[PDB]
Amino acid sequence: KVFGRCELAAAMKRHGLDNYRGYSLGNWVCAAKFESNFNTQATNRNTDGSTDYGILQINSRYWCNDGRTPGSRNLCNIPCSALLSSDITASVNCAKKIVSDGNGMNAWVAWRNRCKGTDVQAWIRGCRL
Incomplete structure (x- = not known):
């Protein structure tokens, strides 16, 4: 399945990812x-x-x-x-384990190179959360 930006944002939140280990939802999306x-x-x-x-x-x-x-x-x-x-x-479920591993989101190379330190709040704008 190919998710929509906001659909995924809501699925993620629903599953406990917003601010999981201090990472706002924008980072996850x-x-x-x-x-x-x-x-x-x-x-x-x-x-x-x-x-x-x-x-x-x-x-x-x-x-x-x-x-x-x-x-x-x-x-x-x-x-x-x-x-x-x-x-x-x-x-x-698995992501939660990975992120708790010690390196945080640096475990995901595209996060590190493309999300880290960018306005991640942009990824959840306009969504009904």
């Missing part, structure tokens, strides 16, 4: 925009053989099981495919 263009089915293969899945492009090296990333962890305790669903619950 900005991250999803640049990571997958709001497409839950996005996938991208990395050079190390790991793959990034879903709306937040969660990596198979540490967070999910795809059965094809030799000696990787499954910290979120889910099959990576669960991250591609129309329902964003697993993606958000």
